[PDB]
Amino acid sequence: QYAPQTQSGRTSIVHLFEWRWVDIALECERYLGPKGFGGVQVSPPNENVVVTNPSRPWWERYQPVSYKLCTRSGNENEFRDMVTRCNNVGVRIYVDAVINHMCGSGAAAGTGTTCGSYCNPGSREFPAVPYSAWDFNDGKCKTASGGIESYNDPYQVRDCQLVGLLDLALEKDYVRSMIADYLNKLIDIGVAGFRIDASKHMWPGDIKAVLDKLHNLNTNWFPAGSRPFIFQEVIDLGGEAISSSEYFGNGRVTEFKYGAKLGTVVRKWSGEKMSYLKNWGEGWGFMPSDRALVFVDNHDNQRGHGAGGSSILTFWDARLYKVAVGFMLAHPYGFTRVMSSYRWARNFVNGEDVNDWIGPPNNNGVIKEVTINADTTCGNDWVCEHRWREIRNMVWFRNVVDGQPFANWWDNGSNQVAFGRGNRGFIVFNNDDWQLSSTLQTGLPGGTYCNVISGDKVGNSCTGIKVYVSSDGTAQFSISNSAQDPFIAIHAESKL
Ligand SMILES: C[C@H]1O[C@H](O[C@H]2[C@H](O)[C@@H](O)[C@@H](O[C@@H]3C(CO)=C[C@H](N[C@H]4[C@H](O)[C@@H](O)[C@@H](O[C@H]5[C@H](O)[C@@H](O)[C@@H](O[C@H]6[C@H](O)[C@@H](O)[C@H](O)O[C@@H]6CO)O[C@@H]5CO)O[C@@H]4C)[C@H](O)[C@H]3O)O[C@@H]2CO)[C@H](O)[C@@H](O)[C@@H]1N
Ligand SMILES: OC[C@H]1O[C@@H](O[C@H]2[C@H](O)[C@@H](O)[C@@H](O)O[C@@H]2CO)[C@H](O)[C@@H](O)[C@@H]1O
Ligand SMILES: OC[C@H]1O[C@H](O[C@H]2[C@H](O)[C@@H](O)[C@@H](O)O[C@@H]2CO)[C@H](O)[C@@H](O)[C@@H]1O
Ligand SMILES: OC[C@H]1O[C@@H](O)[C@H](O)[C@@H](O)[C@@H]1O
Ligand SMILES: [Ca+2]
Ligand SMILES: [Cl-]
């Protein structure tokens, strides 16, 4: 459960948020595979309720009505096709598994669902599964509201309703079996693992009971006896009742402290300096590296939901976002997940984005295709961060330095820092309000390297900055505080 199961050498996963199956299949073949991306985290592939108020929010996909592979992203055939095509080119598929609950208890009875299945949340009836009243935690929850009133009571968090979503009775084998049946179908199709949604809202033991029923991965692409990769979403910034460690036995866990702290440091808020990053990782009180799934931002906190708050860096702050993503992809700690979003019309009212519900780019509710521009960027409002040179080149950096130890750290005692990975790569940042012009030990063998942030190595030349490294591994780095991208990165494979 801790091994990502990505093709050997591929070290990252990308969240292709709200993308359609057919577009992901293409993206795997034309880009993800050739560019060395390890896998894709897809949006919930199971049938969900249709929300008309607001008009088709991105969050309606977190309100299940059945386990049929039929959504705005595509049908089962398109899903199967995607998994096969991606697997064939070395890119794994990870499913976002929504298993803690069904749809909102207040939703109306009917067939207003993505596949036309009938449900009646008032009477707790989901015929398409099937589930009925006895499969929910209603009589178990001890709060007046029937919802989670305090996160300091581990019982409410697990047994009560999260934002009014019908809570499944996970201690029951019937429920556990319906869930494992759904997951097993995906595994057999070829899925490599799952993001367990709202893991904090389930007892570690119930998740375990479900996981023990899972099939080994499909031998057409994975070795015999391979177990699916599991990463549980557990938000724990410290100082709360439930702790991330409670879920270590099930697989990896989301380290939300990572993005919250890194955002504050890169933004330079609360007296934080980049030089404080020397002991980044466990030194900052993070979970064990082999238990963590790390990221700068996720689908929730990039729009105000979840944890992190204003310190979270998103594509909206492109310049600082790339620095943060660059630092994450260069540092040895944890398994990395790169975010890929869509643009929406933000509207702050009282410091709150009232438009945070807006779903993916669409033509009257139908998701738009992902178009690729001549310069390799995307159209139709898909941001495609994974295609920005600075990010795609750092994904490659991580593959190249894989296994190399953190080495040759340097800092100007303020916001200029640098470090390398063994003798395979080196990165330097200037987040200060002044010039960086120093000769640093890179730990790399002499030669001329192409800076992968400002350009690429094309043939026998660099398209951006070139860095001449001498025989003793020393080189000069000049970075202006006004540079478009205030950082430089070079590695074994950008050497001329
Ligand atoms: C019926 C309802 O429908 C809608 O609800 C939406 C919801 O708005 C969407 O966000 C989305 O939710 C997804 C879900 C639910 O399926 C789960 C995922 N993320 C959620 C977490 O799993 C859940 O734990 C919760 O996080 C808590 C956190 O647990 C808690 O600690 C606290 O965090 C603190 C932190 O501890 C503290 O140290 C720091 O200082 O501050 C933090 C902020 O307080 O609070 C967070 C947030 O409450 O919530 C996560 C969102 C998944 O990633 C989500 O996408 O889908 C649902 C269903 O459609 C409507 O919006 C709602 O109004 C309806 N009633
Ligand atoms: O060591 C565990 C704590 O690390 C903290 O990180 C930083 C701190 O924020 C900086 O101001 C500086 O002092 O270095 C620390 C790490 O050496 C973290 O913020 C705390 O929450 C952790 O408990
Ligand atoms: O590879 C495509 C494109 O990526 C980068 O462009 C980004 C830019 O860096 C971000 O700051 C933001 O503005 O989005 C841009 C478009 O996606 C490279 O800078 C650019 O040269 C390159 O063509
Ligand atoms: O003095 C330091 C400098 O020495 C020269 O020999 C090297 O070529 C430079 O890259 C190095 O930074
Ligand atoms: Ca629960
Ligand atoms: Cl997540």
Curated annotation (Swiss-Prot):
The record marks D300 as: Transition state stabilizer. Binds 1 Ca(2+) ion per subunit. One of its GO terms (biological process) is carbohydrate catabolic process. Gene3D superfamilies: Glycosidases (3.20.20.80), Golgi alpha-mannosidase II (2.60.40.1180). Keywords: Calcium, Carbohydrate metabolism, Chloride, Disulfide bond, Glycoprotein, Glycosidase, Hydrolase, Metal-binding, Pyrrolidone carboxylic acid, Secreted, Signal. It is an enzyme of class 3 (hydrolase). This is Pancreatic alpha-amylase. It catalyses: Endohydrolysis of (1->4)-alpha-D-glucosidic linkages in polysaccharides containing three or more (1->4)-alpha-linked D-glucose units. It is found in: Secreted, Extracellular space. Its EC number is 3.2.1.1. Disulfide bonds join C28-C86, C70-C115, C141-C160, C378-C384, C450-C462. GO terms for molecular function: alpha-amylase activity; calcium ion binding; chloride ion binding. It comes from Sus scrofa. One of its GO terms (cellular component) is extracellular space. Ca(2+) binds at N100, R158, D167, H201. SMART domains: Aamy, Aamy_C. Binds to the sea anemone inhibitor helianthamide and magnificamide.
